[PDB]
Design a protein around this ligand. Structure first.
Ligand SMILES: *C(=O)N1C[C@H](NOS(=O)(=O)O)CC[C@H]1C(N)=O
Length: 359
């Protein structure tokens, strides 16, 4: 039986990785041939016995950047900004700073010249502190040359895209983006009425960990969502034509590659690979040196469509959570894996590869 085989395949991929990484709870959602399939494992909260379901809310961390990218794709379809705009076009406080010579594309794709992984601990979630950080920042190397994965970089991209639309980022997400995408279980600021769905996150010694405030957190890493809503988002990415045209175009803008580093082609939010490709290679593209070290880019002569025989993915983590999303445009296949422990990206990719190989 097909439901027995699919359950066996997903269980075989998930169960050992959960044990091995001591993951309390994990939700899988798969889109296959136009149909959704959900597999829920373990506990959302150990202390109260609450089980994971497809409606449990997880922190997705940097997977949030794919939503940020979608907002920016909406601003672009509306002609409120262009990728080649200088960042300081969209924020007068930045005029006269080094952001006069940095494009929005450079910010979105981590090539502004060495913006760091995180804001320094000296910058708190405070508009003035953020402003002053960017005013004073100077590149380590020429913009457009080297990829250094960076929350302040894409954070500023999303902040400027929201400025270009004339409204705060978080308001635009709640009022316009999430409703356009059909997402009612997707939040930047979880409502009190939805808190009972919010899983606990677990760290060292099972310390409980839910993400706290930080500068440009919404734009970099602040979405909480369920496996079912995140799979709805993947299905919108698999079929943008099913949305009203401005939002189809906003999604398409996230399916354009600008350069390569190793096996990976960098889009807005999404990172792409040829498919098939080995597990080792997909793990290496999602490895610690990719998150932490600069890499010289191989720029494409024109943007490349991230479609067909490709896998598009994004990892994300918070202190307490570990998420992974992947889909294969040319096969109508999508997958979401959400967990309440931050466990290594290689292990997330191991689960996903086993599932996608078996589908
Ligand atoms: C993304 O979740 N954040 C940014 C950065 N990206 O790397 S990732 O998804 O390989 O995990 C480091 C992890 C994470 C964060 N802000 O800690």
């Amino acid at each position: 039986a097909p439901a027995d085989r699919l359950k066996a395949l997903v269980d075989a991929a998930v169960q050992p990785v959960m044990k091995a990484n001591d993951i309390p709870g994990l939700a899988v959602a798969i889109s296959l041939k136009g149909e959704p399939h959900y597999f829920s494992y373990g506990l959302a909260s150990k202390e109260d016995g609450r089980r994971v379901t497809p409606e449990t809310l997880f922190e997705i961390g940097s997977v949030s950047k794919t939503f940020t990218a979608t907002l920016a794709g909406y601003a672009l379809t509306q002609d409120k900004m262009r990728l080649d705009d200088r960042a300081s076009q969209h924020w007068p406080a930045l005029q006269g700073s080094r952001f006069d010579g940095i494009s929005l594309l450079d910010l979105a794709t981590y090539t502004a010249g060495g913006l760091p992984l995180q804001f320094p601990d000296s910058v708190q979630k405070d508009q003035a502190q953020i402003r002053d950080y960017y005013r004073q920042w100077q590149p380590t190397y020429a913009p457009g040359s080297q990829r250094l994965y960076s929350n302040p970089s894409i954070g500023l991209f999303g902040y400027l895209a929201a400025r270009s639309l004339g409204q705060p980022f978080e308001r635009l997400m709640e009022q316009q983006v999430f409703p356009a995408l059909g997402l009612e279980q997707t939040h930047l600021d979880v409502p009190e009425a939805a808190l009972a769905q919010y899983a606990q996150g677990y760290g060292k010694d099972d310390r409980p960990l839910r993400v706290g405030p930080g500068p440009l957190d919404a734009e970099g890493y602040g979405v909480k969502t369920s496996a079912a809503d995140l799979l709805r988002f993947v299905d919108a990415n698999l079929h943008p034509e099913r949305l009203d045209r401005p939002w189809a175009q906003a999604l398409d803008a996230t399916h354009r590659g600008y350069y390569k580093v190793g096996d990976m082609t960098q889009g807005l939010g999404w990172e792409a690979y040829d498919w098939p490709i080995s597990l080792k290679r997909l793990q290496a593209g999602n490895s610690t040196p990719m998150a932490l070290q600069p890499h010289r880019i191989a720029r494409l002569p024109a943007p490349q469509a991230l479609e067909g025989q490709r896998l598009l993915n994004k990892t994300g983590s918070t202190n307490g959570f570990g998420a992974y999303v992947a889909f294969v445009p040319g096969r109508d296949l999508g997958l979401v894996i959400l967990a309440n422990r931050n466990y290594p990206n290689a292990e997330r990719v191991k689960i996903a590869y086993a599932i996608l190989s078996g589908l």
